[PDB]
Design a protein around this ligand. Sequence first.
Ligand SMILES: [Mg+2]
Ligand SMILES: [Mg+2]
Ligand SMILES: [Mg+2]
Ligand SMILES: [Mg+2]
Ligand SMILES: [Mg+2]
Ligand SMILES: [Mg+2]
Ligand SMILES: [Mg+2]
Ligand SMILES: [Mg+2]
Ligand SMILES: [Mg+2]
Ligand SMILES: [Mg+2]
Ligand SMILES: [Mg+2]
Ligand SMILES: [Mg+2]
Ligand SMILES: [Mg+2]
Ligand SMILES: [Mg+2]
Ligand SMILES: [Mg+2]
Ligand SMILES: [Mg+2]
Ligand SMILES: [Mg+2]
Ligand SMILES: [Mg+2]
Ligand SMILES: [Mg+2]
Ligand SMILES: [Mg+2]
Ligand SMILES: [Mg+2]
Ligand SMILES: [Mg+2]
Ligand SMILES: [Mg+2]
Ligand SMILES: [Mg+2]
Ligand SMILES: [Mg+2]
Ligand SMILES: [Mg+2]
Ligand SMILES: [Mg+2]
Ligand SMILES: [Mg+2]
Ligand SMILES: [Mg+2]
Ligand SMILES: [Mg+2]
Ligand SMILES: [Mg+2]
Ligand SMILES: [Mg+2]
Ligand SMILES: [Mg+2]
Ligand SMILES: [Mg+2]
Ligand SMILES: [Mg+2]
Ligand SMILES: [Mg+2]
Ligand SMILES: [Mg+2]
Ligand SMILES: [Zn+2]
Ligand SMILES: [Zn+2]
Lengths: 60, 196, 76, 85, 106
Amino acid sequence: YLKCKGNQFKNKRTLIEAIQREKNETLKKKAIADQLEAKRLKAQVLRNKRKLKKDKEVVA
Amino acid sequence: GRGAPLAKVIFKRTEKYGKKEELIIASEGMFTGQYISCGTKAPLSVGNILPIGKMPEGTLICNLEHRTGNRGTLVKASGCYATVVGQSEDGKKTKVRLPSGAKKTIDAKARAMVGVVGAGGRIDKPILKAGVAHHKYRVKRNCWPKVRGVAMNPVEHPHGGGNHQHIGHPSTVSRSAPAGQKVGLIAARRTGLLRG
Amino acid sequence: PKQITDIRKFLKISRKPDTTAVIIMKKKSKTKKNTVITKLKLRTKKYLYTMVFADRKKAERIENSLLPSLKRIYYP
Amino acid sequence: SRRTKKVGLTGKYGTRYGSSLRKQIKKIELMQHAKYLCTFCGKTATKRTCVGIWKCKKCKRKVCGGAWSLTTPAAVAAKSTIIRL
Amino acid sequence: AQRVHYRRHNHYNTKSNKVRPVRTPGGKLTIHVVKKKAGKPKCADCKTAIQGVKALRPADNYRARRKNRTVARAYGGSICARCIRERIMRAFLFEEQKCVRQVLKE
RNA sequence: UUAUCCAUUUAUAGGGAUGAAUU
RNA sequence: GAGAACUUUGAAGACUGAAGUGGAGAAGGGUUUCUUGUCAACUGUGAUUGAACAAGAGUUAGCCGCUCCUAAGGGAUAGCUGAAAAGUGUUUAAAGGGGUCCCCGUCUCAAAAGGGAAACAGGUUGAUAUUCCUGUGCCAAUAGUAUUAUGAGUUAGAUGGUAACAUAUAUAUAAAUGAACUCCUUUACAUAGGCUUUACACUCGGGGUGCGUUUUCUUUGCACUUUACCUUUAUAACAAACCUUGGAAUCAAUUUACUUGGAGAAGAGGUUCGUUGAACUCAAUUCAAAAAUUUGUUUUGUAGCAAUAGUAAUUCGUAAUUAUCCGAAGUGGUAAGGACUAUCCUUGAAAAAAGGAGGGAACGGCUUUGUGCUUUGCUACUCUUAAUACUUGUAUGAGCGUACCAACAACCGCAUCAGGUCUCCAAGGUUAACAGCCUCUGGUUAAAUAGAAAAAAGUAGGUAAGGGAAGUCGGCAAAAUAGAUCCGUAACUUCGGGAAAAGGAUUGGCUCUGAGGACAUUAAUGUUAACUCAGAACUGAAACGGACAAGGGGA
RNA sequence: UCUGAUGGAGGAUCGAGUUGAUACUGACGUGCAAAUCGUUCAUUUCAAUCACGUUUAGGGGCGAAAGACUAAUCGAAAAG
Ligand SMILES: [Mg+2]
Ligand SMILES: [Mg+2]
Ligand SMILES: [Mg+2]
Ligand SMILES: [Mg+2]
Ligand SMILES: [Mg+2]
Ligand SMILES: [Mg+2]
Ligand SMILES: [Mg+2]
Ligand SMILES: [Mg+2]
Ligand SMILES: [Mg+2]
Ligand SMILES: [Mg+2]
Ligand SMILES: [Mg+2]
Ligand SMILES: [Mg+2]
Ligand SMILES: [Mg+2]
Ligand SMILES: [Mg+2]
Ligand SMILES: [Mg+2]
Ligand SMILES: [Mg+2]
Ligand SMILES: [Mg+2]
Ligand SMILES: [Mg+2]
Ligand SMILES: [Mg+2]
Ligand SMILES: [Mg+2]
Ligand SMILES: [Mg+2]
Ligand SMILES: [Mg+2]
Ligand SMILES: [Mg+2]
Ligand SMILES: [Mg+2]
Ligand SMILES: [Mg+2]
Ligand SMILES: [Mg+2]
Ligand SMILES: [Mg+2]
Ligand SMILES: [Mg+2]
Ligand SMILES: [Mg+2]
Ligand SMILES: [Mg+2]
Ligand SMILES: [Mg+2]
Ligand SMILES: [Mg+2]
Ligand SMILES: [Mg+2]
Ligand SMILES: [Mg+2]
Ligand SMILES: [Mg+2]
Ligand SMILES: [Mg+2]
Ligand SMILES: [Mg+2]
Ligand SMILES: [Zn+2]
Ligand SMILES: [Zn+2]
């Protein structure tokens, strides 16, 4: 909306192309960030289960 | 016609069931919805109306009576104020300093408003156009523009006539001159640029 | 003028002391043939009241049962 | 783009009246047409309606003030004096 | 095209002599004079338009229906609802504060 | 201070301690 | 007709060109208006004409105005001054009043453009028309008593909704108690800028009817195809404001521009005003389901007014009858409303009149001891609108204007004078254009004269070889330039300008190419517009803002 | 600080009406006219322009100032 108010698109077709390109890129960034966040979260369970595996033995 | 704003203020009748209306020159800071108090025992604050004998030294005042019960005569134009400068030993007298720089002693029971008159500082804008001055005096009185006496004929003015547009006469006249003759600088103690 | 779409109200108006005339208008429809549209109008002191009848049979019944003291006026 | 180097607001006056008078007009009218904080409601929406009357576009209170600005120093000084007492 | 003229006494274009052309069954253009608008009645406190009443010139207001000129509350069609709410709160709470202050004298 | 002059008001309590108010 | 250049009729050729010798009003005039007659003088030539002369006619209002209110102001009353004549106008009036026993507070005139109860369409005369005729409406007023009907309340004054708010449909939405006193609202208001909606106007294509052209062409060129006030008109649609729920940063919503939100935004669901005035299946009509409120369609109606009127046609007779009156869009001239933005040492009337609210005075009726307060029953009485009957002064709608001109010969200027003199309506083509030029509706073809001839001289114009201000006090007068698009613009400067500086190129017609939207079946298909802008080929006696319109530049 | 758009200020700019009157020292000068006619000029959002009503009266009024204007009369109107 603010882009169109600033005289960036002189035509309807150009606006459609621009929004499609932006949509693809903002989908790809999410699709990389979410998978990195999930994979990073997974390794928190091993790190928080080996703690109790050690502490059930030595810490008492 | 006037440069300063007016406050419309409503009091409540005390001898009877009803309401009454007043028009008062507004001091700088007043707002719609404010309660002001008028009387001999009212607290000292901006917009209250008090007798001048209950004000300490240095108080800035406006809308003053030069005689008691007068309903106000002295400090009224926009941006103007007076100063309390002395209280007498036995009461009954109060000394103030007026905007022109004169000093005066007043009855100590006369009334005034605390604060300065609003909308002050309006002679700091250049007028810059003849039409603006046409619109200024359009709502005051018929006194604009002005032809100068050196550009008339002798029948209409003491300065009129001549082959070169001069006065030819000393332009400072005396206090006793008749009505058709008191026309230049009236009873002038002094002429020229001031240097102090 | 005013319009009425309730038959009972129409017959109530006809019997009142200051109804003095009825108008009958017959007119072929603009769509087809054999379509005698009819309007019946009551002249009271204040307003004409108009009721529209699409059925020539029911309409033809209506003004038969209409009280004899009303003057009748035929426009077509 | 920037449409004017110097005269800014006084470009409506053209070439008339001389440069120094236009400078004083510019200084005065910068204050005259600005916005001021309303102390009653918190928004900055107070604008001048006449030579001494100021009004808030949101809460709709009217405050009596200066000619070209909302406060002049001389009134602020006296108010501070009274409040100190 | 067909051209028109004033039918009434006033022949000048004042605010009370406004005009609107109209086509007749006999096939001609004619003039008709237009009534002036009427301001909306306003709240006695905040000077805002009162909801639920009609805006009529006082001649048309005189012969208008009774329910078209009023609302059913403590101040009807003279003070708006926000103002009435604030008035009620002011009354009750200031009386409570005065009564609290009265007892504390001792 | 009573002649004389001025001012104010509906000639409306003798001096000191941004609700509503009438029968 | 005794007598026709300037009386009338028909046929031609032309003008006005909606900023009109077209329509309607004010000031001013006063019968100039209409019908008939008519020529002594007038109508600067004629005249049978005429605003001239003579006889008789013609102006119709509850709804158009005045009459009422107040304005800038005028005249007055008390008092005071002055020989008076006059000047001034609460300056210490025991005044003016209104309210039913009190309070408020001078009188009167001044607006035919300010304020302000109420009306429309068709027809009609030789001369008047929102005034007459026909039909349909509206506004204001309408005593007392009694009866009869319309509805409502109580067995002393009604209800619904959480809320914003809503409710009386009787022939007709007429009734929802309210005193003294008090407070508000309408009447009621400047300028500039763009955006938007709706009516009137204009235009394109279908259907019907009539007319025109027709050696050749032409599914063709023109005309008509209408719908007022009033019914709170019902209901739709829309710019706004407010209510309920909800709970906002990854800030959102949104305009051409803007604007707005924890003092409660978006989303979802509601209430009201304004605009407008049949839009929306709007109203009736069940074919069959859902109630002791639904589907395509029941099919009707220009929603009533309303076709019975108006217009265009075809008829038969010496007032007569029939058929049409209906399908889809575009352009943006004029007027009004809406929500906004901005400007001011400028902030842009009043009164008559009308409405809303606070407060709570008083009060169920009919006879029932007495002196307004003391005694017994019925738990029909209280409002409201309409009609009737009787008593009452005779229980609707006063008085004045209304013909005509408004300059072209009706006015002022000594006149039938090329002068002066206030307001509203406003078609087609070309075009930025209500300019100029040409045209349709309406108006005219008239001017104190005509025919012939055509030299000097004059007045208003048009051209000129070669030179180009040498003419003259002086480039006086006249020429040269000019629209729009694309390029390019100095000194100086108060930095805003100078500037259209100076300068250079292009412009017709015809045949094509490209760019800019909306909508519905799902990116894929389909329908469907308005006007501008940019390129290419071809073409002509090298011409093209072709007429009109339209800067000379510089030191 | 620079670039593109949006936006619509100003006693801004051309210009028809309106209000005026620069040149031809044009016509006319026994006029159409006791101030007209033609062409050419100045002005159009503001100190703008019109209409009615109203106030100011002669040695006085009114004047963005020319001794201008005050009913064809003004360096002191008109009637007796
Ligand atoms: Mg001089
Ligand atoms: Mg002298
Ligand atoms: Mg000099
Ligand atoms: Mg000397
Ligand atoms: Mg209501
Ligand atoms: Mg003649
Ligand atoms: Mg012509
Ligand atoms: Mg011509
Ligand atoms: Mg023209
Ligand atoms: Mg005649
Ligand atoms: Mg005759
Ligand atoms: Mg003659
Ligand atoms: Mg005669
Ligand atoms: Mg009459
Ligand atoms: Mg009238
Ligand atoms: Mg007055
Ligand atoms: Mg009067
Ligand atoms: Mg009027
Ligand atoms: Mg006539
Ligand atoms: Mg008439
Ligand atoms: Mg209709
Ligand atoms: Mg007439
Ligand atoms: Mg005369
Ligand atoms: Mg003559
Ligand atoms: Mg004439
Ligand atoms: Mg010649
Ligand atoms: Mg030649
Ligand atoms: Mg030559
Ligand atoms: Mg020479
Ligand atoms: Mg020589
Ligand atoms: Mg010389
Ligand atoms: Mg020349
Ligand atoms: Mg230059
Ligand atoms: Mg200008
Ligand atoms: Mg000459
Ligand atoms: Mg001339
Ligand atoms: Mg001289
Ligand atoms: Zn505020
Ligand atoms: Zn309110």
